[PDB]
Design a protein around this ligand. Structure first.
Ligand SMILES: COc1ccc(CNCCS(=O)(=O)O)cc1Cl
Length: 658
């Protein structure tokens, strides 16, 4: 199983390289494998890395290519006019450009398999497409092929899709190699995956990364395990965690911090065509947006996430309602029973379901896990599974029974179709998690729940104060606990925005001084300061020198433990672009101890300015390196939905940033 052609160190400088004499007469049979290690840190908009063409007059559409875009996208064309075949397979956000100054060696493995009638592309260990066709076109069975080309496609005597870049190594095989052989091919990745397709979560997609360094040196990570593509809603989403005991080098197989069982955890390949991509798992309860903090006093780890029941909608579900009823000075969770038109029930002390019309209790109780019992007996519902077999999404019962949960569609008692905030705890630094409890309303009976700011909570150095940032319309709503997260109070901070996704992260500049950096609708990152450990908050200011899009992106922030250029330092992670979610940066600021102002002195580009960078998580690792877990793609763009393994982790050192 050795190569028919092996070549190396080609410089693609807007001048194609001819290798027809070397390669073309080696090609035989209808299955081929291409293996290519290449760099491209200054690509053109659209460029071919490799081409097989009929270069003769009138055959401009008879060619095979492997091409890329300056967006990071990779693909192949397979075209033959006489066969009436023009195939194009691609996937956005498949490449790296740069890392720590140097251009990245990408490893591309393209497999064209005549027997299975399938083409498959891997880049840097990740399968980015696998396509089966009715009519298969062998890549060198294109009518009249007479040219083999590097750095362009030769069409009618001319160079199309001229490439800037280089190909350190290229190999060809007259075989379709096995998925196993592929995994034996060494890579040169600048990144690693913590969460990934096929792992214990069985989720094909991930979004919203978090990181937090625990006091034992264990680094913890949480994330949305998203099942119905990368949709926020409607969908199935669990909250999954993993940890690292070796400074980010290896990571534990993930577990769930928050999960529902009304729908099966399915690894699904969600459609990316324009007709089907907005398909949504519509009948599932789910979570979204996790946040982590560690309490120095009890040693617990605390994780919060937004929760939604199955019946949640977009509009008319259910703003102006918290889902709780105030009775005296206490909040009880509202329920609605099957046939009723209103919420005539509540969950009082020790889960007893009271009938509000008669104020008399029922023979139903609600347990620790929000499950329904009648006379102490576990009621159950049937689970759903999703498929695209009928050429469209179906959600159907699957025979398996699961505990009846008040967040479910099939449940006898239902919660208000709005958003809530749930909290869980681990006493073993992420090895297991308790059943979550719902947090009570903070803005009164008649106000839908605020939105958790994904990332980290803040543990104040000089006390036992724990703070979680949330957002609602017109304000940041901080959640403050002084008793290991047993009780919470809110601290409201007005912002100049109605209906913003004001995702906020905090750093402590010095004892009792919190700066919160948050996403806005102005194209600039905002901030406010507290000087009383979160009791009161300043007016809002903005950062210049960094740009976001109008709709904006989540920003992550940490106080660096070490001085830089003699001054105390803060690190921000964010896209730097007013067009999309690309141009990822780590920005280093030094604090002016006279006014607590921040001079943003250093900008580190995570990859190319045109390459995808979205939601992110930063942590200072015990060895003082920096770990970054991030969405390496444009998670806003309607053209980059439902990609697998784009959430990635890198290790950086401070000198890398300066
Ligand atoms: C509680 O449910 C939600 C909370 C936040 C959000 C917003 N997520 C924003 C992500 S992004 O659109 O900016 O990429 C959506 C839902 Cl459905």
């Amino acid at each position: 199983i050795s190569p028919i052609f092996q070549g190396g160190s080609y410089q693609l400088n807007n001048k194609s390289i001819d290798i027809s004499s070397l390669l073309l007469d080696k090609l035989s049979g209808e299955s081929q494998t291409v293996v290519m290690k290449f760099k491209a840190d200054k690509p053109n908009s659209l460029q071919a890395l490799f081409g097989l063409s009929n270069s003769k007059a009138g055959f401009k559409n008879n060619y095979f290519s492997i091409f890329m875009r300056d967006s990071g996208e990779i693909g192949v064309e397979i075209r033959d006019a006489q066969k009436g075949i023009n195939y194009l397979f691609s996937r956005p956000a498949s490449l790296w450009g740069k890392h720590k100054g140097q251009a990245v060696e990408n490893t591309l493995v393209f497999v064209s398999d005549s027997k299975d009638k399938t083409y498959t592309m891997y880049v840097n260990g990740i399968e980015v497409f696998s396509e089966t066709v009715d009519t298969f076109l062998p890549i060198s069975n294109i009518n009249g092929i007479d040219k083999a080309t590097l750095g362009a496609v030769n069409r009618e005597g001319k160079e199309h899709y001229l490439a800037k870049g280089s190909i350190d190594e290229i190999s060809l095989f007259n075989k379709a190699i096995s998925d196993q052989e592929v995994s034996t091919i060494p890579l040169s990745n600048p990144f690693q995956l913590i969460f990934q397709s096929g792992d214990s979560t069985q989720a094909n997609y991930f979004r919203i990364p978090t990181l937090y360094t625990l006091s034992s040196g264990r680094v913890l990570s949480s994330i949305d395990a998203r099942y119905g593509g990368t949709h926020d809603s409607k969908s199935k989403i669990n909250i999954a965690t993993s940890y690292s005991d070796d400074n980010g080098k290896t990571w534990s197989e993930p577990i769930f911090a928050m999960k529902f069982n009304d729908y099966e955890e399915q690894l699904v390949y969600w459609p990316r065509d324009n007709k089907l991509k907005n398909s949504q798992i519509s009948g599932s309860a789910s979570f979204i947006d996790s946040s982590i903090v560690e309490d120095k006093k009890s040693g617990k780890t605390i994780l919060l996430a937004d929760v939604m029941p199955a019946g949640i909608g977009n509009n008319n579900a259910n703003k102006a309602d918290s889902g709780f009823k105030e009775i005296n000075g206490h909040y009880y969770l509202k329920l609605k029973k099957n046939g009723d038109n209103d919420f005539r029930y509540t969950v009082r002390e020790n889960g007893v379901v009271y009938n509000e019309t008669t104020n008399k209790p029922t023979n139903y109780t609600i347990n620790d896990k929000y499950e329904v019992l009648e006379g102490g007996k576990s009621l159950t519902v049937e689970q759903y599974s999703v498929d695209f077999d009928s050429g469209s999404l179906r959600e159907r019962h699957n025979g398996k029974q699961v505990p009846m949960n008040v967040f479910y569609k099939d449940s006898l008692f239902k919660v208000t179709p709005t958003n809530y905030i749930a909290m869980t705890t681990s006493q073993n630094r992420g090895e297991s998690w308790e059943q979550f409890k719902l947090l009570p309303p903070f803005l009164g009976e008649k106000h839908n729940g605020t939105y958790l700011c994904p990332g980290q909570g803040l543990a104040l150095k000089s006390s036992n104060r724990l703070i979680f940032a949330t957002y609602t319309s017109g304000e940041l709503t901080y959640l403050i606990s002084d008793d290991s997260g047993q009780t919470w109070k809110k601290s409201s901070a007005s912002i100049p925005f109605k209906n913003a996704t004001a995702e906020a992260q905090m750093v402590e500049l010095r004892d009792g001084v919190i700066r919160t950096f948050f996403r806005t609708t102005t194209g600039k990152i905002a901030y406010m300061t507290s000087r009383d450990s979160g009791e009161t908050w300043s007016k809002v200011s903005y950062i210049d020198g960094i740009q976001q899009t109008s709709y904006g992106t989540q920003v992550s922030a940490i106080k660096y433990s070490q001085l830089i250029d003699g001054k105390e330092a803060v690190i921000l992670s964010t896209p730097n672009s007013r067009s999309g979610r690309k141009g990822g940066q780590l920005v280093v600021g030094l604090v002016n101890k006279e006014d607590d102002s921040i001079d943003w002195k250093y900008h580190y580009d995570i990859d190319l300015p045109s390459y995808g960078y979205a939601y992110s998580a930063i942590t200072e690792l015990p060895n003082h390196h920096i770990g970054v877990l991030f969405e390496k793609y444009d998670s806003w763009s309607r053209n980059e939905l439902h990609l697998s393994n784009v959430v990635q982790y890198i290790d950086l050192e401070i000198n890398d940033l300066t």
